[PDB]
Amino acid sequence: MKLSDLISRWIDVEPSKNAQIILRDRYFMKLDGNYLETKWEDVARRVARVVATAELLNPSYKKNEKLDRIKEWEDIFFRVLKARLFIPNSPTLFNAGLGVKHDLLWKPIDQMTLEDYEEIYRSRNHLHMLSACFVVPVGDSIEEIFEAVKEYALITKVGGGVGSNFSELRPKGSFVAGTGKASGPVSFMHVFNSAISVVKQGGALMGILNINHPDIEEFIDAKKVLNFFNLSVGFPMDKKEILKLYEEDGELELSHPRSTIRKKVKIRELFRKIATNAWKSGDPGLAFLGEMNKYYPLYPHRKINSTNPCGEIGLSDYEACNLGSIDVAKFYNNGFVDLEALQELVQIAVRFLDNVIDVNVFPIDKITKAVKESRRLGLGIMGFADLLYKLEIPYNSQEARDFAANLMAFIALHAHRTSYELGKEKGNFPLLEISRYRTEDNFVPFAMGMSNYDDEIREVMKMTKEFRRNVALLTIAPTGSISNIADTSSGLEPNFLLAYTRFVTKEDEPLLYVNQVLREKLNPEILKRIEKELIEKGSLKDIPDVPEKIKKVFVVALDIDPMDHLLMQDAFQRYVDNNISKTINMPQSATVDDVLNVYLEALRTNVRGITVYRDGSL
Amino acid sequence: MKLSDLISRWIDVEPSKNAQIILRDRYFMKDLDGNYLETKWEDVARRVARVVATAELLNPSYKKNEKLDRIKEWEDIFFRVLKARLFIPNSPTLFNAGLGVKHDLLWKPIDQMTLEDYEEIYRSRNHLHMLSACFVVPVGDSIEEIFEAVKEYALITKVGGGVGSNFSELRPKGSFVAGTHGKASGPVSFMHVFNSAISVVKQRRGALMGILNINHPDIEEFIDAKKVLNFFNLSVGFPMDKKEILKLYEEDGELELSHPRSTIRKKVKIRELFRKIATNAWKSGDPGLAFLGEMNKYYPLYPHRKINSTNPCGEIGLSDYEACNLGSIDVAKFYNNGFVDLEALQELVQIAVRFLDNVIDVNVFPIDKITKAVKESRRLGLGIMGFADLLYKLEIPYNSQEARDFAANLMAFIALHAHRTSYELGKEKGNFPLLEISRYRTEDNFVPFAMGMSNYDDEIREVMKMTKEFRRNVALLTIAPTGSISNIADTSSGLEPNFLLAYTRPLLYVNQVLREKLNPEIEKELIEKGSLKDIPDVPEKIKKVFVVALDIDPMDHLLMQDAFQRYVDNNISKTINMPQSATVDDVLNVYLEALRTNVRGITVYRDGSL
Ligand SMILES: Nc1ncnc2c1ncn2[C@H]1C[C@H](O)[C@@H](COP(=O)(O)OP(=O)(O)OP(=O)(O)O)O1
Ligand SMILES: Nc1ncnc2c1ncn2[C@H]1C[C@H](O)[C@@H](COP(=O)(O)OP(=O)(O)OP(=O)(O)O)O1
Ligand SMILES: Nc1ccn([C@@H]2O[C@H](COP(=O)(O)OP(=O)(O)O)[C@@H](O)[C@H]2O)c(=O)n1
Ligand SMILES: Nc1ccn([C@@H]2O[C@H](COP(=O)(O)OP(=O)(O)O)[C@@H](O)[C@H]2O)c(=O)n1
Ligand SMILES: [Cl-]
User: Fold this and answer.
1) Which of A70, A122, A517, B91 sits a CA distance of 20 to 30 A from B234?
2) Which atom of ligand 4 lies at the shortest distance from residue B487's CA?
3) How far is ligand 3, taken at its centre, from the CA of residue A224, in Å?
């Protein structure tokens, strides 16, 4: 069906009362604390109008027509936004229009003149930061360490999540031209933690240390406060290499350019250390940085050393990335995903995300540059688990994973063809010429190998040798907050729970929530009886008197075994040029051996990183 | 007698074994192997003198066929007062002088020194060649400025400095912050980041100064912050006149707590704020009080520049990005026949001031703004140590009007000749850049301290007028703790009474002057009891004389501070010791007498309180 007509079916559907609480708490703009916005329509309008003002910069538009052209983009943007088919990362919702006079952000589009958009463009203040994901380096000097703590605080203040690889820092007890002797990365990481603890935005930071750093063991056991850090162990070498060393029971030398300190450790003992900690507490994860550089169009002229906090974007030094997600559950139509409307939305969403770069303001000049030059986007999806329920497809099945790979491949195809086109109309990312899209033949920024679309995707990548707006376009984020605004499942995650009682504060209340798809499918009287047990058990699986087909379909996170989580992440990653946010849920009864087995399988699949969460551990 | 003769008396007295251990431990230079380049005090003295003399290269009054002679002459004079331990510079000068320089130039005989040799010492001083103990930086009201100040703390701590700040610009906790739903974290909470920075950058550890002004809305939280600021000394700032605060107090008035970038307001009774300050000091020693207005009253560049903070022990009031190098005279070595040898003292004061001013020239800072602030004002901290031991020798009891009048006259004579030395260096080398906008140039009768307790006052007034025309330094004097340098010097610390006459250091130690004076058949009861007061058959004249910190009541501590502060242009480090039985009201009474006298700040420590 036409995107038009899907917009119609959603545009007058208001957010649930749950989404509305989140919105007034956090999203609706407010001196001294009065609401300038009271409906999601209000958010959609302000954001639509501000992202649309980037069309001022379009070299392919003549001065006459510019107002026409801009209003057209405002209205579609507004329509997909209000309908909740696509929502950008939170910072876009929070910060769009900051610094702009309130008479201009909600004004009827009727009364918008071309000098009103020009006024919007030039009044964006130092806080107009619309992107979620950042990486900064932490060089081996007191100067560079503390510039980086400053950078963390500046990024955080404006609503960014930031990560670093701390491996440049020489090991603890290393020689310093001082003085003393080097504190080592773990103890400097406390300064960064201490800083975010006082910069209150309203897991937060990613800190990575590489597997061959002499302080790695300390780093693995560091969270056992550091409470604001997610930690990952970095593998800048090739996955295959580490797999083989493991398989032969080999040893790894721990060493550092600027220390004499060296140790040999068995790779299995180190792995088991990691797995034991992650079994107990969820940290540290694994970051396969070598796998990310493998698919990075600019490597080695540039290099990915770290991810942002939730691990879904691998970023070079000072790079940033703005994200946004399509609710694929809204795309269900009579046993099929409606690809005609999904194609149009991918097109709109890539333009939306690329225009955000043009109206974004960063607090550090190096970040502004790093971004101008690459124009990395993070288009993803949410509502995927719910889409499966509608299609009657068990999440833990080869059917779901093949469908997942075809769906992502379709999106990757039309995302990169939109980038092709934007490069033609607006100009190429400055670094096209030195990227693998130019200097190579047959370069594809992801593994593929599970879809009919692979040839067409090869064709697209070849075409983008010539025209290409963006270094990379796709990610799957956690969507913790935008999936709640949109009333849908998060990211590619299964639903964690089908039913739970939530609580309204009123003024001076328990109100049962049931998954809406489940509500529409199960006999309402079967629902009434089983509800009690479903809430206590957290699952339908052991509930007598629930039909078997329902149940096979309506699995939640802990019904789905760890390998079936991991393989779903593999299926998506084959068609995503950045990385993926996936929690590998494990049952309380999983051992440290089971965790190691996940890591081992992880090395053989196409995943770019790993997070495990064992039920009841924390 | 001539300083040269006084030197000969001290030059070959070797540092004690206690002093030598300190020296080997952290002052003797080592090579990459951890092998010692220096093994003797003499080597530090040669190294430091040589390095500080090389500043004479920049002297615009020397030829052309003259410079090498004049430099070796300064090097020789510096070397000899150093070796004798008559004057010692602040520790970082000891630690860091000569860094970057080849080792064959550093300890080479003065007589084999060539002009090119000095030129190469000077050119090869590295980024670590940091020779000053005392820093102040601003902490402005923005995340940007806060974390730039945190970077500065780091960089300063790394190269060996102590830094202080006034946090009062930061908006109170809970203030509106544009563009977010979070509230301002507030000064106390942001201090946590400074503490955590210093916990991870080794200096031999730096305590920090943190000040919040009495009229800041978070002031009560600040007073209570120390029961994770374990690195901070904390002082309450009083930017208003001390008269005004004393009055407000006596009249049982109110203080408006407010901030220009917050709606958070409150009114509090001054007596009640003072009582909380006093209760916390009684418990733990913190917070002390910093009379910033009194400091600014005597600041020659006020109001264009202002002092908002001290460095960590409070002895220097510093304007933003300003730093200061210190040095101390061991006055105890100037005793001669029932008198202080003022002939020798005047000469060492002249030498010390030059030595201190030359340090600015070979000093290297890690921030450009500090470099500029120091070039522009050339502030010095010439002090004394050995004061209590010098009183022992003169047979004067520390807790007597006699001791305070003696201290006033002694500090007055030092101030006189230091400021006269500054006039002359002004003339010979050029004035400090800011002289002409300073109150030595723009006022008449500006004197940078209260005087009032000496025969020297009128002569001091004349020298101040003279320095309308020539003046090298904005200010010159201080009294420092001298916590390490009085140890190296084998003498009592700063102006402080000895804390104890005998203390285990399995070691064990007896004050040298008591030792050369007490009938050597007269000790067990002193190491335990801590005093001579209640040993009987110890003659009552030794005893009146040989008093320690806790024999001297709080007002005699405080009036001793006053006596010195009237002739010191920067500030003074003095702890007001109190007996364990003192009450919160006894503290408040110290506070009130402090506000009436000429002291520039207060630190109390009440015995057994930790
Ligand atoms: N004083 C200190 N305390 C603790 N750690 C320090 C200290 N100084 C330096 N470090 C650590 C921080 C960095 O990881 C590393 C090097 O710092 P720094 O010495 O500033 O770099 P640099 O490149 O200027 O000097 P270098 O000549 O030693 O390499 O050692
Ligand atoms: N997110 C935050 N959490 C806690 N404190 C904050 C936060 N943001 C700012 N502050 C504090 C730090 C300072 O004391 C004060 C102002 O910081 P900042 O907003 O960077 O100043 P600014 O000069 O940029 O203000 P403005 O945006 O009003 O021009 O508020
Ligand atoms: N405290 C935090 C934690 C993560 N983040 C960032 O938010 C990014 C995406 O998270 P998400 O998709 O759940 O975000 P929204 O649903 O809130 O848009 C993460 O990858 C982090 O970079 C942040 O800004 N602040
Ligand atoms: N651990 C220390 C001790 C003193 N200092 C600085 O030295 C000043 C003088 O202290 P002091 O006179 O006892 O020090 P020394 O020169 O004797 O070591 C203090 O106010 C600090 O600014 C420091 O930075 N770190
Ligand atoms: Cl020191």
Assistant:
1) B91
2) 17
3) 24
